[PDB]
Amino acid sequence: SMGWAAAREAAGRDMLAADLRCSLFASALQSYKRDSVLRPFPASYARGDCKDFEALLADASKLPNLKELLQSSGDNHKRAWDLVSWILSSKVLTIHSAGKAEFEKIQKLTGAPHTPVPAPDFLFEIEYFDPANAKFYETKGERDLIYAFHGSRLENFHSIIHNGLHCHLNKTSLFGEGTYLTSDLSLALIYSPHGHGWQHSLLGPILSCVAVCEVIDHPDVKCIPPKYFVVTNNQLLRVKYLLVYSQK
Ligand SMILES: NC(=O)c1ccc[n+]([C@@H]2C[C@H](COP(=O)(O)OP(=O)(O)OC[C@H]3O[C@@H](n4cnc5c(N)ncnc54)[C@H](O)[C@@H]3O)[C@@H](O)[C@H]2O)c1
């Protein structure tokens, strides 16, 4: 992962996106589902197959807010810096804070909501690097891109971002067709209840998050609105935006 000096520069460039990643990490770690949802897991807290969640929870509770972590020297918060550097490291993607120009663009690409919806408090964009970025465009070719929503519990978003949405084909189930998406934000929001984030977060301690996916228009995508649809191949979609709602 990144060193401390590199992480300090990466966090300083976009404090709200660094905070979102710490918040989603804290949500996944605090959940009773941490064993399955805190993936990727920081290898320094594992002894082979044995994940030391008590030591990890104990060290995550020592993280100060990001402004204080940056306002102070490195050797003041050693375990904190090692953890934050790992949280902000990825060779696959990065997250950027976005504005009203990008939210207006999302509304245009998904269509005017049929039903009243709240405006998000924060909006983030996921940028992908090669080989993942070039792989997605090679799969796309000349095909059109469709934008659709996927709601989920807050504790799933650390894993959703780094591993992608599960396209789990389960023949022994009522809901094993693949990834379920909807063109309507109001339908996705009922699947995004408010969850516990990070107490020292700039975004607030209680958040709801909705994924905006970029979907390749392909026959394997089973049906700019078209109610709710199913994606059977994980190569045909990627999470592109995160709509974040902070409970006041
Ligand atoms: N999710 C929505 O926005 C949405 C909207 C409208 C209808 N539905 C219906 C709800 C029902 C089953 O779908 P649903 O429960 O949403 O999906 P699911 O049954 O396919 O999966 C279970 C859970 O896994 C979550 N998940 C996906 N990828 C990951 C990952 N990498 N890490 C941790 N968690 C992950 C996912 O978000 C969902 O909550 C179908 O009838 C859907 O059409 C869902």
Tab-separated table of C-alpha atoms and ligand atoms in Angstrom:
chain	number	residue	atom	x	y	z
A	1	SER	CA	0.000	0.000	0.000
A	2	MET	CA	0.986	3.762	-0.086
A	3	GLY	CA	3.499	5.194	2.381
A	4	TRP	CA	2.372	7.876	4.885
A	5	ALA	CA	3.673	10.911	2.904
A	6	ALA	CA	1.917	9.650	-0.273
A	7	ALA	CA	-1.326	8.959	1.690
A	8	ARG	CA	-1.223	12.420	3.274
A	9	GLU	CA	-0.993	13.979	-0.246
A	10	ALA	CA	-3.801	11.660	-1.615
A	11	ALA	CA	-6.130	12.503	1.372
A	12	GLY	CA	-5.362	16.266	1.171
A	13	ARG	CA	-6.306	16.306	-2.555
A	14	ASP	CA	-9.899	15.161	-1.766
A	15	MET	CA	-10.692	15.085	1.959
A	16	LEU	CA	-14.394	14.129	1.476
A	17	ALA	CA	-13.557	11.141	-0.805
A	18	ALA	CA	-10.838	9.972	1.684
A	19	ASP	CA	-13.424	10.388	4.490
A	20	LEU	CA	-16.061	8.378	2.523
A	21	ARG	CA	-13.548	5.456	2.184
A	22	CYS	CA	-12.762	5.568	5.970
A	23	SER	CA	-16.556	5.702	6.676
A	24	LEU	CA	-17.360	2.688	4.428
A	25	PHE	CA	-14.395	0.793	5.958
A	26	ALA	CA	-15.790	1.611	9.470
A	27	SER	CA	-19.350	0.551	8.438
A	28	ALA	CA	-18.141	-2.841	7.060
A	29	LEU	CA	-15.844	-3.442	10.083
A	30	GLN	CA	-18.502	-2.534	12.747
A	31	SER	CA	-21.233	-4.717	11.160
A	32	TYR	CA	-21.815	-8.210	12.673
A	33	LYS	CA	-21.230	-9.288	8.984
A	34	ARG	CA	-17.554	-8.001	9.050
A	35	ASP	CA	-16.221	-11.548	8.258
A	36	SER	CA	-17.918	-11.496	4.828
A	37	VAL	CA	-18.293	-7.707	4.095
A	38	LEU	CA	-14.866	-6.397	5.210
A	39	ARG	CA	-13.223	-7.602	1.989
A	40	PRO	CA	-10.559	-6.537	1.091
A	41	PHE	CA	-9.186	-7.045	4.618
A	42	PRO	CA	-5.847	-5.399	5.753
A	43	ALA	CA	-3.252	-8.273	5.748
A	44	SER	CA	-1.327	-6.712	8.721
A	45	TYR	CA	-4.389	-7.728	10.944
A	46	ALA	CA	-4.369	-11.329	9.733
A	47	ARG	CA	-2.220	-14.333	10.760
A	48	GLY	CA	-2.611	-16.473	7.609
A	49	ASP	CA	-6.334	-17.439	7.464
A	50	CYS	CA	-6.987	-16.012	11.000
A	51	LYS	CA	-8.391	-12.456	10.794
A	52	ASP	CA	-7.885	-10.563	14.047
A	53	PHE	CA	-11.107	-8.456	14.079
A	54	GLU	CA	-10.763	-7.508	17.793
A	55	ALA	CA	-7.278	-5.931	17.153
A	56	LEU	CA	-8.643	-4.266	13.968
A	57	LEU	CA	-11.774	-2.848	15.730
A	58	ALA	CA	-9.522	-1.693	18.604
A	59	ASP	CA	-7.168	0.174	16.139
A	60	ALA	CA	-9.977	1.635	13.978
A	61	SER	CA	-11.428	3.202	17.188
A	62	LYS	CA	-8.047	5.054	17.584
A	63	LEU	CA	-8.375	6.907	14.238
A	64	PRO	CA	-8.803	10.676	14.773
A	65	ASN	CA	-10.835	12.750	12.288
A	66	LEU	CA	-8.907	13.244	8.990
A	67	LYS	CA	-8.291	17.003	9.563
A	68	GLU	CA	-6.599	16.221	12.932
A	69	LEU	CA	-4.736	13.252	11.409
A	70	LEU	CA	-3.343	15.617	8.691
A	71	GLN	CA	-2.893	18.698	11.065
A	72	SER	CA	-0.580	16.553	13.264
A	73	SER	CA	2.785	14.836	12.525
A	74	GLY	CA	3.035	11.165	11.381
A	75	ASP	CA	4.600	9.479	14.468
A	76	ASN	CA	1.702	10.873	16.666
A	77	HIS	CA	-0.826	8.410	15.113
A	78	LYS	CA	1.338	5.451	13.817
A	79	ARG	CA	-1.307	2.624	13.674
A	80	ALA	CA	-3.817	5.216	12.410
A	81	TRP	CA	-1.519	6.262	9.496
A	82	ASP	CA	-0.805	2.574	8.576
A	83	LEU	CA	-4.566	1.849	8.448
A	84	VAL	CA	-5.590	5.082	6.595
A	85	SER	CA	-2.723	4.509	4.043
A	86	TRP	CA	-4.101	0.963	3.349
A	87	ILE	CA	-7.772	2.277	3.158
A	88	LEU	CA	-6.771	4.890	0.495
A	89	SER	CA	-4.610	2.544	-1.544
A	90	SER	CA	-5.812	0.902	-4.718
A	91	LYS	CA	-4.115	0.226	-8.071
A	92	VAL	CA	-7.560	-0.520	-9.639
A	93	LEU	CA	-9.576	2.629	-8.856
A	94	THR	CA	-9.895	5.950	-7.049
A	95	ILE	CA	-12.863	7.989	-5.768
A	96	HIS	CA	-13.513	11.702	-6.450
A	97	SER	CA	-15.934	14.149	-4.827
A	98	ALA	CA	-18.399	15.360	-7.483
A	99	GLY	CA	-20.765	18.368	-7.748
A	100	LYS	CA	-24.267	19.456	-8.906
A	101	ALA	CA	-23.110	19.418	-12.596
A	102	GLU	CA	-22.475	15.628	-12.298
A	103	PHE	CA	-25.764	15.034	-10.322
A	104	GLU	CA	-27.728	16.899	-13.089
A	105	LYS	CA	-25.933	14.640	-15.634
A	106	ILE	CA	-27.000	11.488	-13.602
A	107	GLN	CA	-30.658	12.727	-13.521
A	108	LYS	CA	-30.505	13.234	-17.343
A	109	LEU	CA	-28.929	9.778	-18.005
A	110	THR	CA	-31.483	7.945	-15.765
A	111	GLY	CA	-34.519	10.090	-16.532
A	112	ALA	CA	-36.772	12.345	-14.440
A	113	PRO	CA	-38.013	10.463	-11.304
A	114	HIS	CA	-41.609	9.138	-11.559
A	115	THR	CA	-41.985	9.612	-7.744
A	116	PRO	CA	-40.513	12.302	-5.319
A	117	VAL	CA	-36.877	11.632	-4.293
A	118	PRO	CA	-34.425	13.460	-1.969
A	119	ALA	CA	-31.300	15.110	-3.400
A	120	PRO	CA	-28.055	13.456	-2.122
A	121	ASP	CA	-25.890	15.349	0.423
A	122	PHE	CA	-22.695	14.128	-1.313
A	123	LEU	CA	-21.917	12.645	-4.699
A	124	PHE	CA	-18.805	10.677	-5.638
A	125	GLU	CA	-17.414	9.321	-8.894
A	126	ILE	CA	-15.371	6.114	-9.213
A	127	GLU	CA	-12.467	6.398	-11.728
A	128	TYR	CA	-10.942	3.098	-12.920
A	129	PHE	CA	-7.306	2.530	-13.993
A	130	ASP	CA	-5.862	0.012	-16.488
A	131	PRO	CA	-6.184	-2.984	-16.962
A	132	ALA	CA	-9.773	-2.699	-15.486
A	133	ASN	CA	-10.650	0.568	-17.343
A	134	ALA	CA	-9.362	-0.666	-20.776
A	135	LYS	CA	-10.987	-4.126	-20.144
A	136	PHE	CA	-14.445	-2.500	-19.590
A	137	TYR	CA	-14.160	-0.419	-22.823
A	138	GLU	CA	-12.938	-3.490	-24.819
A	139	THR	CA	-16.111	-5.358	-23.629
A	140	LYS	CA	-18.237	-2.273	-24.529
A	141	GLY	CA	-16.904	-1.796	-28.083
A	142	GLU	CA	-19.383	0.416	-29.996
A	143	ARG	CA	-22.332	-0.633	-27.679
A	144	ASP	CA	-24.265	2.068	-25.757
A	145	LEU	CA	-23.980	2.636	-21.998
A	146	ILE	CA	-27.071	2.478	-19.732
A	147	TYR	CA	-27.143	4.063	-16.240
A	148	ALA	CA	-29.133	2.337	-13.485
A	149	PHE	CA	-29.313	2.268	-9.662
A	150	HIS	CA	-28.524	-0.352	-7.049
A	151	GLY	CA	-29.424	0.198	-3.418
A	152	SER	CA	-27.727	-1.705	-0.587
A	153	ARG	CA	-26.981	-1.608	3.144
A	154	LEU	CA	-24.102	0.785	3.989
A	155	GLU	CA	-21.840	-2.039	5.350
A	156	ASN	CA	-21.744	-3.617	1.824
A	157	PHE	CA	-20.258	-0.603	-0.042
A	158	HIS	CA	-16.540	-1.091	0.913
A	159	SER	CA	-16.843	-4.575	-0.748
A	160	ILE	CA	-19.151	-3.350	-3.612
A	161	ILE	CA	-16.515	-0.724	-4.602
A	162	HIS	CA	-13.392	-2.919	-4.406
A	163	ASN	CA	-14.867	-6.263	-5.608
A	164	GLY	CA	-17.768	-5.039	-7.796
A	165	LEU	CA	-21.432	-6.079	-7.455
A	166	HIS	CA	-21.916	-9.888	-7.025
A	167	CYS	CA	-23.276	-11.524	-10.223
A	168	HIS	CA	-23.961	-14.717	-8.259
A	169	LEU	CA	-25.863	-17.123	-10.498
A	170	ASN	CA	-27.702	-19.300	-7.935
A	171	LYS	CA	-30.045	-21.871	-9.561
A	172	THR	CA	-31.294	-23.041	-6.082
A	173	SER	CA	-32.943	-19.639	-5.228
A	174	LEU	CA	-35.853	-17.215	-5.887
A	175	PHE	CA	-33.232	-14.372	-6.373
A	176	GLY	CA	-30.134	-15.946	-8.047
A	177	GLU	CA	-30.486	-14.517	-11.572
A	178	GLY	CA	-27.527	-12.068	-11.155
A	179	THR	CA	-27.262	-8.340	-10.260
A	180	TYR	CA	-30.626	-6.541	-9.852
A	181	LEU	CA	-30.704	-2.884	-10.959
A	182	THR	CA	-33.464	-0.298	-11.417
A	183	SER	CA	-33.917	2.836	-13.574
A	184	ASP	CA	-35.890	4.417	-10.689
A	185	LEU	CA	-33.882	5.976	-7.792
A	186	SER	CA	-37.005	5.781	-5.538
A	187	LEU	CA	-37.041	1.936	-5.872
A	188	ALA	CA	-33.276	1.707	-5.196
A	189	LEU	CA	-33.550	3.983	-2.076
A	190	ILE	CA	-35.866	1.519	-0.268
A	191	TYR	CA	-32.889	-0.974	-0.475
A	192	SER	CA	-30.492	1.652	1.001
A	193	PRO	CA	-31.443	2.094	4.710
A	194	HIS	CA	-29.415	4.496	6.874
A	195	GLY	CA	-26.475	2.696	8.506
A	196	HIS	CA	-23.720	3.495	10.996
A	197	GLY	CA	-20.631	5.018	9.371
A	198	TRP	CA	-17.679	6.584	11.220
A	199	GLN	CA	-18.098	8.772	14.340
A	200	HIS	CA	-15.242	11.120	13.256
A	201	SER	CA	-16.571	11.516	9.669
A	202	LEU	CA	-16.937	14.904	7.886
A	203	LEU	CA	-20.015	13.348	6.201
A	204	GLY	CA	-21.790	12.593	9.490
A	205	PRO	CA	-21.977	9.328	11.495
A	206	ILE	CA	-25.186	7.949	9.840
A	207	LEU	CA	-25.310	7.411	6.076
A	208	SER	CA	-27.336	5.852	3.262
A	209	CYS	CA	-25.592	5.037	-0.014
A	210	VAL	CA	-26.914	4.219	-3.538
A	211	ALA	CA	-24.733	2.946	-6.426
A	212	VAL	CA	-25.104	4.380	-9.931
A	213	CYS	CA	-23.912	1.706	-12.367
A	214	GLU	CA	-22.639	2.041	-15.915
A	215	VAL	CA	-24.090	-0.907	-17.842
A	216	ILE	CA	-23.062	-2.085	-21.349
A	217	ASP	CA	-26.207	-2.443	-23.566
A	218	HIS	CA	-25.879	-6.196	-24.371
A	219	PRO	CA	-28.381	-9.173	-24.800
A	220	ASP	CA	-27.162	-10.652	-21.399
A	221	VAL	CA	-28.632	-7.516	-19.670
A	222	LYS	CA	-32.258	-8.704	-19.152
A	223	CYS	CA	-34.987	-5.988	-18.987
A	224	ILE	CA	-33.594	6.431	-20.023
A	225	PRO	CA	-36.021	4.214	-17.995
A	226	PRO	CA	-36.962	0.425	-18.051
A	227	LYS	CA	-38.156	-0.215	-14.385
A	228	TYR	CA	-35.946	-2.983	-12.758
A	229	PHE	CA	-33.560	-5.354	-14.719
A	230	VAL	CA	-30.948	-8.191	-14.249
A	231	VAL	CA	-27.253	-8.388	-15.290
A	232	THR	CA	-25.957	-12.025	-15.508
A	233	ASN	CA	-22.336	-11.167	-16.531
A	234	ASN	CA	-20.171	-9.043	-14.111
A	235	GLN	CA	-18.045	-7.840	-17.115
A	236	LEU	CA	-21.075	-5.850	-18.445
A	237	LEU	CA	-21.291	-3.343	-15.546
A	238	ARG	CA	-19.308	-1.273	-13.065
A	239	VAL	CA	-20.220	1.087	-10.217
A	240	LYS	CA	-19.599	4.631	-11.506
A	241	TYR	CA	-21.178	6.941	-8.871
A	242	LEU	CA	-22.112	6.858	-5.198
A	243	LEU	CA	-25.109	8.899	-3.951
A	244	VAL	CA	-24.668	9.603	-0.245
A	245	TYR	CA	-27.454	10.725	2.140
A	246	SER	CA	-26.488	11.936	5.591
A	247	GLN	CA	-29.119	11.657	8.365
A	248	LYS	CA	-29.593	15.002	10.167
B	1	LIG	N1	-30.998	-3.447	-4.892
B	1	LIG	C1	-31.893	-2.645	-5.489
B	1	LIG	O1	-31.687	-1.435	-5.697
B	1	LIG	C2	-33.145	-3.250	-5.866
B	1	LIG	C3	-34.149	-2.403	-6.506
B	1	LIG	C4	-35.416	-2.905	-6.850
B	1	LIG	C5	-35.711	-4.259	-6.608
B	1	LIG	N2	-34.740	-5.138	-6.010
B	1	LIG	C6	-35.155	-6.538	-5.817
B	1	LIG	C7	-34.702	-7.224	-4.553
B	1	LIG	C8	-34.534	-8.710	-4.950
B	1	LIG	C9	-33.102	-9.280	-4.744
B	1	LIG	O2	-32.091	-8.286	-4.948
B	1	LIG	P1	-30.998	-7.726	-3.866
B	1	LIG	O3	-31.256	-8.218	-2.441
B	1	LIG	O4	-31.035	-6.251	-3.949
B	1	LIG	O5	-29.751	-8.401	-4.496
B	1	LIG	P2	-29.202	-9.856	-4.231
B	1	LIG	O6	-30.253	-10.771	-3.784
B	1	LIG	O7	-28.714	-10.214	-5.643
B	1	LIG	O8	-27.925	-9.806	-3.247
B	1	LIG	C10	-27.949	-9.736	-1.830
B	1	LIG	C11	-27.119	-8.498	-1.360
B	1	LIG	O9	-25.762	-8.558	-1.780
B	1	LIG	C12	-25.288	-7.251	-1.924
B	1	LIG	N3	-24.021	-7.235	-2.696
B	1	LIG	C13	-23.813	-7.234	-4.016
B	1	LIG	N4	-22.498	-7.247	-4.271
B	1	LIG	C14	-21.840	-7.200	-3.116
B	1	LIG	C15	-20.532	-7.139	-2.730
B	1	LIG	N5	-19.477	-7.128	-3.562
B	1	LIG	N6	-20.248	-7.074	-1.443
B	1	LIG	C16	-21.183	-7.086	-0.322
B	1	LIG	N7	-22.515	-7.165	-0.858
B	1	LIG	C17	-22.804	-7.208	-2.136
B	1	LIG	C18	-26.426	-6.617	-2.687
B	1	LIG	O10	-26.273	-5.278	-2.668
B	1	LIG	C19	-27.669	-7.158	-1.985
B	1	LIG	O11	-28.013	-6.391	-0.878
B	1	LIG	C20	-34.919	-8.823	-6.412
B	1	LIG	O12	-36.317	-9.179	-6.475
B	1	LIG	C21	-34.570	-7.394	-6.863
B	1	LIG	O13	-35.049	-7.055	-8.178
B	1	LIG	C22	-33.467	-4.630	-5.641
